[PDB]
Amino acid sequence: AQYEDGKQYTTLEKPVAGAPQVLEFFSFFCPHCYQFEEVLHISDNVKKKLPEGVKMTKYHVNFMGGDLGKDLTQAWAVAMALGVEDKVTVPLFEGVQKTQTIRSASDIRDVFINAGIKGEEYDAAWNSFVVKSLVAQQEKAAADVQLRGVPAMFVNGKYQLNPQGMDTSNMDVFVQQYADTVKYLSEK
């Protein structure tokens, strides 16, 4: 057929109960994730095609970058709690990988301050248990899909996107296939 298990996607041996409908994993340290987000715009292209009543969820991962990697997962939790993901995603990627001016937790915070988030507001969120549980949720989700690498995307806790089974040709043909595959999986 057009969409095939083992080609555009794979099927988790162990489906995840109560998982987000569309779950993306990434790291601000991840060069392919930079490409995915800032050049290919995978998230946005996927969202433009998602059915009504389907939400996209995006989690950060710890295993790249040591202590700064975990700081970034905690800051991503802050971004989720404050609902400012679309203000900090680009300057966090560029700060980590382009300018490489993000080297400490304070440098991360600066990105939020510069983006208009009040210091008191960031710090309260940073130290909150709501953010601790969001960090735990992201870690839990990684365990549940038995995550081995980023970027990655899972649909309805049952299917894993398999970009190596898609075409690499035109980045755009690739992006369209990826987005088309997510939509197909969402309706499966």
Side-chain angles (χ1 to χ4, degrees):
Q2 291 296 344
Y3 298 99
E4 281 166 9
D5 197 320
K7 187 52 177 154
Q8 298 92 343
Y9 70 94
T10 54
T11 304
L12 293 173
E13 39 205 295
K14 269 146 148 53
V16 184
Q21 290 170 305
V22 180
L23 177 60
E24 183 182 350
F25 289 90
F26 77 109
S27 170
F28 288 113
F29 271 105
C30 161
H32 279 157
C33 305
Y34 188 104
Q35 294 298 317
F36 254 48
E37 180 60 26
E38 302 295 302
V39 179
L40 297 181
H41 302 281
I42 291 291
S43 293
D44 185 69
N45 274 275
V46 169
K47 285 177 198 164
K48 288 173 343 194
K49 288 180 172 173
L50 290 176
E52 243 186 287
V54 184
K55 38 183 329 180
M56 177 146 202
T57 305
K58 173 139 69 170
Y59 290 164
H60 196 264
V61 305
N62 293 334
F63 60 83
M64 298 183 73
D67 218 90
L68 195 56
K70 272 213 74 160
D71 281 325
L72 287 161
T73 302
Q74 185 161 350
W76 186 247
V78 168
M80 290 189 283
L82 295 176
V84 299
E85 302 96 323
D86 306 334
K87 310 179 168 183
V88 300
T89 291
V90 166
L92 287 170
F93 264 121
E94 297 193 345
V96 176
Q97 295 192 43
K98 182 188 188 168
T99 60
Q100 291 181 1
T101 44
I102 294 178
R103 306 168 218 101
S104 72
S106 180
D107 301 331
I108 298 173
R109 182 173 181 282
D110 289 343
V111 165
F112 286 71
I113 302 308
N114 191 60
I117 287 86
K118 292 182 195 182
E120 58 184 314
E121 181 171 57
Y122 181 93
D123 295 342
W126 177 272
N127 296 296
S128 72
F129 285 90
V130 155
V131 161
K132 295 185 195 306
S133 55
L134 277 169
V135 171
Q137 280 182 42
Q138 300 174 80
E139 297 167 343
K140 179 44 155 77
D144 286 348
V145 298
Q146 300 190 22
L147 191 64
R148 255 176 331 198
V150 287
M153 197 174 299
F154 301 84
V155 177
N156 295 317
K158 221 177 318 186
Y159 307 105
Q160 189 174 340
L161 275 294
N162 191 37
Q164 64 176 29
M166 302 172 185
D167 179 357
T168 67
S169 138
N170 172 35
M171 337 153 69
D172 290 319
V173 171
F174 170 80
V175 172
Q176 286 301 313
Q177 182 166 30
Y178 195 109
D180 285 345
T181 301
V182 181
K183 175 163 202 300
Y184 158 85
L185 290 177
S186 73
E187 302 162 346
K188 201 167 161 76

